[PDB]
Amino acid sequence: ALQELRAQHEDQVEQYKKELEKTYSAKLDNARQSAERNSNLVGAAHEELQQSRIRIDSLSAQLSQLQKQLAACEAKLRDLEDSLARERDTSRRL
Amino acid sequence: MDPEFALQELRAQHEDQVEQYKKELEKTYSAKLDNARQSAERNSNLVGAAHEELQQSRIRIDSLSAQLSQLQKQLAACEAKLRDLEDSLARERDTSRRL
Amino acid sequence: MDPEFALQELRAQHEDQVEQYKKELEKTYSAKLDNARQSAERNSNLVGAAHEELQQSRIRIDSLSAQLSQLQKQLAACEAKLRDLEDSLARERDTSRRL
Amino acid sequence: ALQELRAQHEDQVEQYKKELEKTYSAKLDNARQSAERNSNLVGAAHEELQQSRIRIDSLSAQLSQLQKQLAACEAKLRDLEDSLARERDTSRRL
Hey, CA dihedral for B68, B71, B77, B82, is it positive or negative? Predict the structure, then answer.
């Protein structure tokens, strides 16, 4: 009875261990799978933000081009205002 | 003699017509002067208003450029939190591969 | 009699001076006409160039607005990847609290 | 000798188990700590992106205001161009 109980226990522990290591291997593999998917959703969010980064770099360059164009328009209007001021003052002298 | 009375009357006709012409000319000249004065003042007022509005627009574009720079700064810090996140998830990946 | 020769000579003096004045007036008038023509053509050319440049600037601002919208779309998708990341890290947090 | 070996083994397994559960509790706690820090770096990146979101909403509103202002400038220039065209044509008629 004693050695029968001890042999029965040893087989139970042997079965428990194999079931333990198999679950421990499944845990380590699912932690790998769920972490990878997280890593691209990390990296994809990074690359989509970097795309936006360089779009606003382009937007700032285009704002500077627009600013030069309006500055040239203003210089033409200053010239025109000068010429029209001379004509106004001439009419005032008549 | 007799032609002398036609001379005198021609002269008198001429002086009446010169006076009439002087009045007609002065009225026409003052109307064209007024019309030219009003058009000159309006063209100067218009070009000044247009010019002023453009100076306003340039101030607005200067502000927009400054705000784009702050937006750059804001999106830089967002990239930092994303890189550290990349980093620690990669730390967990490396440690998991080594079991 | 004798005054008649002063009359005739006065008339002759007057006709010479009227002819001189006609020439002087025609030259002055043509110069002021040319000056006014050139200034009018230049003012029209200037305001047309200014106006055209402003139409160019409006096209540029229409483009900038369109690009801001695409930037909105790009940053929306970035928020999606950040929310799902939020979501799965929260999934791991909840599961860890339950041990 | 037999029962001495079996008692010695039982004490070893008892000591191994307590050392196992203590390490298993330390593992579960560090996974909690490292995941939290990851979660704010997630959420802080989210809130800083949302801040940028509403800045560009403001930028688009300001672009529309600027567009109206330039459209009003253009209408003044059209008026001025009309008036100057009439003066040009008048000078051409002289």
Answer: negative
**Amino acid identity, position C5:** F
Question: Scanning every residue of chain A, which has its alpha carbon at the shortest distance from the alpha carbon of B90?
Answer: A39
Chain C residue with CA closest to B85: the answer is C85
- The alpha carbon torsion through B69, B65, A68, A74 (nearest 10 deg) reads -160
Taking the CA of residue B82 and the nearest CA in chain C, the distance in Å comes to: 9
Resolution in A: 1.8
Q: Which of A41, A72, A87 sits opposite C81 (nearest CB)?
A: A41
- Distance from the C19 Cα atom to the nearest Cα atom in chain D, whole angstroms: 23
Query: How many C-beta atoms lie closer than 10 Å to residue D81's C-beta?
Result: 18
φ/ψ of residue A21, rounded to 5: -65, -30
Contact B61 A66 (CB under 8 A): yes
Largest CA distance in chain B: 145
Annotate D2-70 with DSSP letters as a single string: HHHHHHHHHHHHHHHHHHHHHHHHHHHHHHHHHHHHHHHHHHHHHHHHHHHHHHHHHHHHHHHHHHHHH
